[PDB]
């Protein structure tokens, strides 16, 4: 069973938001409803608010073992 903390570190927010914002800037599909928003990153954070982002992080341990976690499943606080 997974052991690492259930809180999303701030570095994870920054990297998931960056990568998804880059994916949105290309013609990748978008699934949150957009209220006329245009900036790729405001959309990125809207998809974070609605827990729709389709990414999975892979938390590595220093021995080489790891733990997947859905981005839509971590504990997120501003």
């Amino acid at each position: 069973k997974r052991i690492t903390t259930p809180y999303m570190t701030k570095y994870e927010r920054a990297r998931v938001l960056g990568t998804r914002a880059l994916q949105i800037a290309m013609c990748a599909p978008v699934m949150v409803e957009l209220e006329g928003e245009t900036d790729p990153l405001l959309i990125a954070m809207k998809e974070l608010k609605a827990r729709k982002i389709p990414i999975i992080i892979r938390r590595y341990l220093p021995d080489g073992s790891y733990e997947d976690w859905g981005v839509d499943e971590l504990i997120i606080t501003d």
Binding site: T4, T5, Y7, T9, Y11, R59, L61, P62, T77
Partner: protein, 199 residues
């Protein structure tokens, strides 16, 4: 003569401001150039680039200094209890006595969600709540207020009022604050040390 002596003391200091930056820069360099590589891993150890151990737990307990509300200490218990009373001054509830307080707090903290916490901290909040139990005892002793709730001057219960709803709220809040002050894995603890020491 007074002007000449005073300008001598002025120049002495004004020479300093540039000079006292002469050593500061090279502490700022030599430190960070030996210590910027240390980082905090997902297993709560502190490891160098090659993966060797420096510290089995960061700081001994894994708390970052930017989240310390107290004097090097995560909470100020007195402050939190006073705040939580003010925002929820329930007028319906009855006030607890020493016995009900201890039984209530045992009823809550026995649940496993609190057992996941660091035991040191759990015992710490126990010690505080015992402390408040003693004081409510003294007040009720000095005034001899009966616990039945029937004494005509109802205002006597306003003196050391706590109600169960406030106690549960207080415990959940301490749990948050402690749980959100851990050094997040991946932090550059090594370089933060250098900036805090050169500054």
């Amino acid at each position: 003569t007074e002007f000449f002596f005073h300008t001598m003391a002025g120049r002495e200091g004004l020479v300093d401001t540039a000079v006292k930056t002469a050593e500061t820069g090279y502490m700022q360099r030599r430190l960070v150039k030996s210590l910027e590589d240390l980082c905090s891993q997902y297993d709560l150890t502190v490891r160098s680039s090659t993966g060797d151990i420096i510290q089995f737990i960061y700081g001994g307990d894994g708390l970052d200094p930017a989240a310390m509300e107290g004097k090097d200490e995560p909470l100020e218990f007195k402050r939190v209890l006073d705040n939580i009373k003010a925002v929820f001054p329930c007028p319906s509830e009855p006030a607890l006595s020493k016995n009900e307080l201890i039984l209530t707090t045992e009823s809550i903290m026995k649940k496993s969600e609190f057992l996941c916490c660091q035991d040191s901290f759990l015992q710490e909040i126990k010690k505080f709540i015992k402390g408040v139990s003693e004081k409510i005892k003294k007040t009720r002793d000095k005034y001899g207020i009966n616990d039945n709730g029937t004494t005509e001057p109802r205002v006597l219960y306003q003196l050391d009022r706590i109600t169960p709803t406030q106690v549960e709220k207080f415990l959940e809040t301490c749990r948050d604050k402690y749980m959100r002050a851990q050094m997040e894995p991946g932090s550059a603890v090594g370089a933060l040390c250098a900036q805090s020491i050169g500054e």
